[PDB]
């Protein structure tokens, strides 16, 4: 059951994908609002996917070794120049994480977009599936495609100070490494903003 | 039923799985408005107290059920015991504004007072946790989060109740821990 995504001009086509899961909505709410006086100019140039290395999966890691990633992370291309040149913006996130095994090692990796992150105290983790998630395990699907719309206490925010979403990747089952299966499996993320709007051109150096 | 599962599709199966006729459900006592309409106690209290939400005890009903959702929105029914004049102002108010008193104030009724103070915070909807640095590195909620600031000459108790509340984006609830047994085994009425 293959699945071909597409954003901007780059594409990630993963055969192992089981299905996209939307978070909290199928689509964002209205963009125009009293704040900014409808000065927003939808910039679709940043819809690119960008890789990002994540905590390496090792037979060692027990249940609950959370590896978080704050969003938007340092991005050094179009999106970075944008968030440094514009004051306010907003985006849906459309994350995509892929852990490629040899299909001979068992382990259930749980990837969930949790908004407004705050350190869990190892009792909360059991309840980490409350938000948008997909179980990425070598036995069935090597990828998880989650797309969440931007949501925050305001219509727009300064990404320099307020970072709503954090892609957390909890290790539900320790990766059992068989002789045939890969002992260590790395985790890479295709994170790609969607419906990115901006506002208020900001004077740069 | 053997669903795909690892796609995390919300699959559920009743009793009809093995010749079981399912019975009706009434799910009113768990409505998020009826579970938030009830009062709650805020502790501690002192003169010049920000009536800012999530200052309630964690394990209380309204407390936990509100910390069960990242984003909430609600109109407050405030109930204060007080001893003098009680003045109340919205989130965007300079500390000095409380004194003058034409901005709403309730004189000392013989029992405690009761007041409706609406949702005044300028943000679209409030939050229980704010990730990111303070405005100009701690999860320290911004001052615009609190609904209002009350000052009376002295406050004995304070109760709060959220009306017409709707909660967004649920969060973990973190039930009590029990060990060295299999049921919590609390004394029952």
């Amino acid at each position: 059951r293959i699945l071909t995504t597409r954003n901007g001009h780059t594409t990630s086509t993963t055969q192992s994908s089981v299905g996209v899961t939307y978070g909290y909505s199928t689509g964002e709410d209205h963009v125009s609002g009293p704040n900014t006086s409808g000065l927003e100019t939808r910039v679709v140039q940043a819809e690119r996917f960008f890789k990002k290395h994540l905590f390496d999966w090792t037979t060692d890691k027990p249940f609950g070794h959370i590896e978080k990633l704050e969003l938007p992370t340092d991005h050094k291309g179009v999106y970075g120049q944008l968030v440094d040149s514009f004051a306010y913006m907003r985006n849906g996130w459309d994350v995509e994480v892929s852990a490629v095994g040899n299909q001979f090692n068992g382990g259930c990796l749980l990837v969930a977009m949790v908004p407004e992150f705050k350190e869990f105290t190892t009792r909360e983790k059991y309840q980490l599936t409350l938000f948008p998630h997909q179980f990425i395990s070598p036995r069935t699907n090597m990828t998880a495609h989650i797309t969440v719309p931007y949501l925050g206490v305001n219509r727009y925010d300064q990404y320099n100070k307020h970072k709503p979403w954090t892609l957390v990747v909890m290790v539900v089952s320790p990766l059992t490494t068989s002789s045939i299966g890969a002992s260590q499996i790395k985790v890479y993320t295709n994170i790609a903003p969607t419906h990115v709007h901006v506002a208020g051109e900001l004077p740069s150096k | 039923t053997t669903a795909t599962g690892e796609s995390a599709d919300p699959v559920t199966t009743t009793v009809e799985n093995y010749g079981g006729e399912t019975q009706v459900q009434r799910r009113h006592h768990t409505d998020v408005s009826f579970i938030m309409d009830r009062f709650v106690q805020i502790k501690p209290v002192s003169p010049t107290h920000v009536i800012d939400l999530m200052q309630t005890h964690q394990h209380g009903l309204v407390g936990a059920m509100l910390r069960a959702a990242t984003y909430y929105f609600s109109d407050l029914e405030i109930v204060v015991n007080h001893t003098g004049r009680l003045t109340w102002v919205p989130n965007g108010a300079p500390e000095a504004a409380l004194d003058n008193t034409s901005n709403p104030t309730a004189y000392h009724k013989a029992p405690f007072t009761r007041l409706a103070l609406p949702y005044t915070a300028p943000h679209r909807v409030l939050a229980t946790v704010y990730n990111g640095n303070s405005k100009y590195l701690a999860a320290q909620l911004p001052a615009s989060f609190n609904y209002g600031a009350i000052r009376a000459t002295e406050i004995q108790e304070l109760l709060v109740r959220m009306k017409r509340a709707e909660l967004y984006c649920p969060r973990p609830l973190l039930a009590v821990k029990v060990t060295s047994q299999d049921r919590h085994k609390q004394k029952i009425i």
Partner: antibody
Amino acid sequence: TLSLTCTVSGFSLSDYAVGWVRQAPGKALEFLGSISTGGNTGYNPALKSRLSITKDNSKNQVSLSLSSVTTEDTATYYCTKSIHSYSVFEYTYMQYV
Amino acid sequence: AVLTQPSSVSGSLGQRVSITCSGSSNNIGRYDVGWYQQIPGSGLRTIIYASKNRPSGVPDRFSGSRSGNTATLTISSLQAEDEADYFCATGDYSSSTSVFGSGTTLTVL
């Protein structure tokens, strides 16, 4: 024997596993033993049958003692709280504090 | 034991200094190592646990890399209090814990 049981400050010993480690004179280290929070214990396969590891779960006190203590067994013993309630293997414990 | 590190390391304040830790596919190739710190006094105040993350309560400079088959500790800037005996520690797949870190006498130079 030799018991150098250090109790935990806060940090409910209910959900956290603990392990002790010996730092030989100078700088030379060996992992002594670790007890999973579920009551399960893990200790070096080389170093066994002399260690008494147990977790009072109620008094926030962890118990270990060494028998046949000899002068060569001597170190600046520590105790450190692991970030995992249980360890998949008996030896991988050292990795997490 | 088998986990070998440069027993001495030269570094100075102003530039980044690293610490290499080398072992094979048994020990490091598929197991997370741990970087601890010790000043001459005492302690295991962990610079890097789980190979990738520093414990909450340490400056962000200490970066920990689990590249190739040997875990490397990278101090982006040193300080005077930076010098101590760092240690590399991890488990071996076909052996015991072997937390063996020879220790890297560090110097501010």
